[PDB]
């Protein structure tokens, strides 16, 4: 519209209306020029890592992309509390996205001292991939989100993708994408950008913990009309074989017939946060649960959703079983345990098997007069008819949605790191500075121009999500567990800035506080 006019206003709010919540967040972003306007082939050799499990082939692009795929992008900590204490479930419905107040800057550096000026005629390009034609990187739990704290100014991350590799080489089946090959909207400083998106129908994420367990569903006062085999021998001595049967009843609850059984399991190794209880050897990689694809090993991480530990043992955690978040200020490599926050899934132990335990036992032979009954341990158990389970929890720090891979078949496509699986997720939003070449020579040359005016852009983004709520209906008489702050005094308020202006999130906050019957 105009240079001296603003193309949008700041909106950060929550609106709680009945069965729905609407979040809106505005942030300030900065987009650099990436790769100095080049597409580049990258590989593990351009990086230098040699291991087969780590080999890759791909491209880096000049483009950036917006990532709002974490819950703290949309919820303040008070909003999250207000969500999780009152609601049995929630799920996303609609999305509104705006890009406005674009400013392109020119950087000049004569002697190590940068001068910055407005370039009023430069453009930024933006498009959404609404046909899902690009590789989709928003579901890999990458950094670069809109920051949780609204006053922080964030950097737009660089878009890059991988294709098929063999070692560090490509194959004929490998795909290369030019993002210039898509139509996009060009924005000078007066222009703004928007689009809206409709989420596809997904289940409500369950945000409750079961107050009843899968093996206790019986009436404790009454017998079954079913019999179980109680005794195979009369007593000591030879030739004592017999068949004795008893009613399964309140006093022996382990043997009662049950309609539903616990969900599937893939065993994780158990580690203690008391390190002297751990073994004196390196087993982080060697003891890991893994899966193999085309000759390469991937860690099973976080893997199938399983109870983190047994009742009363909170010092143990599955090795690659749980999502692990870092504290504010924590470094990149080889930090101590007090630097990280380890989530635990204990609320699902009512229906989901424990991650560090066997699923159970099966018979391994035919017993006989000459052979004793033998059993063996089930270390991994696929879906059986009659299993029920809970998916993994979502966190304030965690991801919201993933893209379901496009395949012939999938089973229960809920993303393993947690959240809502979608065949058509929120589309990727791509952005770049339009290159402005430096002065060309005065005689024609056929080469592409390699010399550009140094630029970066900045602006505002607003994202608005309508969320559908499932309100708690409970008849429970006694009071629930609620997420709460602690009154006791401290140097800092939690979920606030400190004396240096640094916002931090001191803990992970899951969604499961209220209870339901099983």
């Amino acid at each position, epitope marked *: 519209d105009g240079v001296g006019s603003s193309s949008g206003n700041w909106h950060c709010d929550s609106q709680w209306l009945g069965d729905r919540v609407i979040t809106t967040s505005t942030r300030t972003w900065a987009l650099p020029t990436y790769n*100095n306007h080049l597409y580049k*082939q990258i590989s593990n*050799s*351009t990086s230098g890592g040699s291991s087969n499990d780590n080999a890759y082939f791909g491209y880096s692009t000049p483009w950036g992309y917006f990532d709002f795929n974490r819950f703290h992008c949309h919820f303040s900590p008070r909003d999250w509390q207000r969500l999780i204490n009152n609601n049995w479930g929630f799920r996303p419905k609609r999305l509104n996205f705006k890009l406005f107040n674009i400013q392109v800057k*020119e950087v*000049t*550096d004569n002697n190590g001292v940068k001068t910055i000026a407005n370039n009023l005629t430069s453009t930024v390009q933006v498009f959404t991939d609404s046909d899902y034609q690009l590789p989709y990187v928003l579901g890999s739990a990458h950094e670069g989100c809109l920051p949780p704290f609204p006053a922080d100014v964030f950097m737009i991350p660089q878009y890059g993708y991988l294709t098929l590799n063999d070692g560090s080489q490509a194959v004929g089946r490998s795909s290369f994408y030019c993002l210039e090959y898509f139509p996009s909207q060009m924005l000078r400083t007066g222009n703004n950008f928007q689009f809206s998106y409709e989420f596809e129908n997904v289940p409500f994420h369950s945000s409750y913990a079961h107050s009843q367990s899968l093996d206790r569903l019986m009436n404790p006062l009454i017998d079954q009309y079913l019999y179980y085999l109680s005794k195979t021998i009369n007593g000591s001595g030879q030739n004592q074989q017999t068949l004795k049967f008893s009613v399964a009843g309140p006093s022996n609850m382990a043997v009662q017939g049950r309609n539903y059984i616990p969900g599937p399991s893939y065993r994780q190794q158990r580690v203690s946060t008391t390190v002297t209880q751990n073994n004196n050897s390196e087993f982080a990689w060697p003891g890991a649960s893994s899966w193999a694809l085309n000759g390469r090993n991937s860690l099973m991480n976080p893997g199938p959703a399983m109870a983190s530990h047994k009742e009363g043992e909170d010092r143990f955690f599955p090795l690659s079983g749980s999502l692990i978040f870092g504290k504010q200020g924590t470094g990149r490599d080889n930090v101590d345990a007090d630097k990280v926050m380890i989530t635990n899934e204990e609320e699902i132990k009512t229906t989901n098997p424990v991650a560090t335990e066997s699923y159970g036992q099966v018979a391994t032979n035919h017993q006989s007069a000459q052979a004793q009954a033998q059993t063996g341990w089930v270390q991994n158990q696929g879906i059986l008819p009659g299993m029920v389970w809970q998916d993994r929890d979502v966190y304030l720090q965690g991801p919201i949605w993933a893209k379901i891979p496009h395949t012939d078949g999938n089973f229960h496509p809920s993303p393993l790191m947690g959240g809502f699986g979608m065949k058509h997720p929120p589309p990727q939003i791509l952005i770049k500075n339009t290159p402005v070449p430096a002065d060309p020579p005065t005689a024609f040359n056929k080469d592409k121009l390699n010399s550009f*005016i*140094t630029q970066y852009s900045t602006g505002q983004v607003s994202v608005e999500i309508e969320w559908e709520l499932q309100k708690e209906n409970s008849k429970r008489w006694n009071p629930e567990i609620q997420y709460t702050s602690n009154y006791y005094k401290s140097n800092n308020v939690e979920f606030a800035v400190n004396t240096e202006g640094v916002y931090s999130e001191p803990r992970p906050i899951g969604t499961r506080y209220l209870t339901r019957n099983l």
Partner: antibody, heavy 131, light 108 residues
Framework: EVQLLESGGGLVQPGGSLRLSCAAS????????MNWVRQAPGKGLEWVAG????????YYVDSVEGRFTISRDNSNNMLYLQMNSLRAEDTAVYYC??????????????????????????WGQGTTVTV | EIVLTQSPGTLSLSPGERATLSCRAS???????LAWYQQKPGQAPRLLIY???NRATGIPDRFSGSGSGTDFTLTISRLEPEDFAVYYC??????????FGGGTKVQI
């Protein structure tokens, strides 16, 4: 100051394999293209091999093609030249050399991409290989 | 491989005299991209001029260079004693192999 220090050269029989290494410091190594230059006794300099800053593009003189392999490690600041099937005329002094331009350069208001091969600004001292 | 030939071979001039060297290319050298190197006995070679006229950092101000197309010149004005050495021209303007000139020697 930029320093190129090479080691691993020496005398060996013909037909043998010798892996020549070079250690660099004083500059960001992954942003520069590297070279191997060769001078036989009493004769001028001969450019042998050169390698892209990324490592994905590696070139050789016509004579040594297929015999020599140039490679680099951006984490270790190391340039490697490994030789196979050495000959009477491969005997010489071998120099490390660094291109004068980084792949991207900032001057004034302008940022420039330099991905070609450029004049060699810094040299190592040389290490003799006798076949 | 496109060839560089140096016009003067084993040239000798008295100190304090202008020195003019000429490197001739069989093929045009793309967007200049020629380089002059100095080597001294038992000493690693040293960059003087890169591209056409462009002088390296630590180099005396008396060294000059110019050229276009197939003809390039290295000029040494106000000659001094340390300037006795073998000189070379390098062509990076094409695709590799980078090829040095044959070499040229400047005596006393």
């Amino acid at each position: 100051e930029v320093q190129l220090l090479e080691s691993g050269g020496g005398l060996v029989q013909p037909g043998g394999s010798l892996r020549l290494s070079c250690a660099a410091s004083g500059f960001t190594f992954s942003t520069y293209a590297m070279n191997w230059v060769r001078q036989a006794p009493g004769k001028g300099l001969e450019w042998v091999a050169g390698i892209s800053a990324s490592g994905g593009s590696a070139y050789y003189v016509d004579s040594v093609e297929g015999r020599f392999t140039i490679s680099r490690d951006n984490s270790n600041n190391m340039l490697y030249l490994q030789m196979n099937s050495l000959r009477a005329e491969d005997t010489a002094v071998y120099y490390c050399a660094k291109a004068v331009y980084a792949i991207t350069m900032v001057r004034g208001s302008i940022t420039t991409n330099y991905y070609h091969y450029y004049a060699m600004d810094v040299w190592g001292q040389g290490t003799t290989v006798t076949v | 491989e496109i060839v560089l030939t140096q016009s003067p071979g084993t040239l000798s001039l008295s100190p304090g005299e202008r020195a003019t060297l000429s490197c001739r290319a069989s093929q045009g050298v793309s967007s200049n991209y020629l380089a002059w190197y100095q080597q001294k006995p038992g000493q690693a070679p040293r960059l003087l001029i890169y591209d056409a006229s462009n002088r390296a950092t630590g180099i005396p101000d008396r060294f000059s260079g110019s050229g276009s197309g197939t003809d390039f010149t290295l000029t040494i004005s106000r000659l001094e004693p340390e300037d006795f050495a073998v000189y070379y021209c390098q062509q990076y303007g094409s695709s590799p192999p980078l090829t040095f000139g044959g070499g040229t020697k400047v005596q006393i």
